[PDB]
Amino acid sequence: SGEYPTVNEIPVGEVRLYQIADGVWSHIATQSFDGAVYPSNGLIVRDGDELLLIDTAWGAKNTAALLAEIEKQIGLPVTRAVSTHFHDDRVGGVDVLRAAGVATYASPSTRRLAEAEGNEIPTHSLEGLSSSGDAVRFGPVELFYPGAAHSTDNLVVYVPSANVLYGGCAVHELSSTSAGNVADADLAEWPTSVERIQKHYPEAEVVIPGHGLPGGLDLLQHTANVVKAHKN
Ligand SMILES: C[C@@H](c1cccc2c(-c3ccc(CS(C)(=O)=O)c(F)c3)c(C(=O)O)[nH]c12)N1C(=O)CN(CCCCN)C1=O
Ligand SMILES: [Zn+2]
Ligand SMILES: [Zn+2]
């Protein structure tokens, strides 16, 4: 009823949307992995009379439900999707998207990692993102490669019309004490990568993590802190 959705308020097998700004929504879904349940976020950005999707809803059925929720709530066609790293919470559902006619994109790094992992593989490669600090435009967003963090391939997404920074899994929510699933992380580089985000997007007004509640710029420093404490 207006609060940011959580696993306790999303019915089984469903997806919820949350309005972030004019023409900007997050999507929230839940999934189980290794016998625990987790929420995860993605982004939807209006692109004229079409939509740009950032990240799947973590699974084929969740991603089908995401498409249905978008049709119900927004009613504009999703024409393109970008996955911000190779893990299943970002690419699981790309096959659903592709069969629905959505053009799916990721960096070449992400596409290689997804293929090697046995995860679903976005169709189109996003060049111009291979060095830390690189940025490219993609419809109504800027894509930015901050360096290795949660994963070596993680991208961040900025919506300049609204000053919305979608950090993806390189950014944690404020209530976190721990640094999430670090299996593929670079804990030593992660703070440097966060510093690059802070320097590039100093006017961000909303910061959205890959999992959990959006907030402000504090999520960036908080993430650096939790990562350093984990490494320690
Ligand atoms: C699919 C993905 C994955 C699964 C389960 C949980 C998470 C989490 C995660 C987020 C927040 C918290 C709460 S908190 C801040 O308080 O800790 C948490 F507890 C875990 C993250 C994330 O941090 O973004 N991602 C996860 N994922 C990986 O990321 C690495 N991996 C292993 C490789 C599998 C290859 N097929 C995996 O399955
Ligand atoms: Zn991940
Ligand atoms: Zn994640």
From TrEMBL:
Its EC number is 3.5.2.6. It is an enzyme of class 3 (hydrolase). SMART domains: Lactamase_B. SUPFAM superfamilies: Metallo-hydrolase/oxidoreductase (SSF56281). NCBIfam families: bla_class_B_core, bla_subclass_B1, blaVIM. Monomer. This is beta-lactamase. It comes from Pseudomonas aeruginosa.
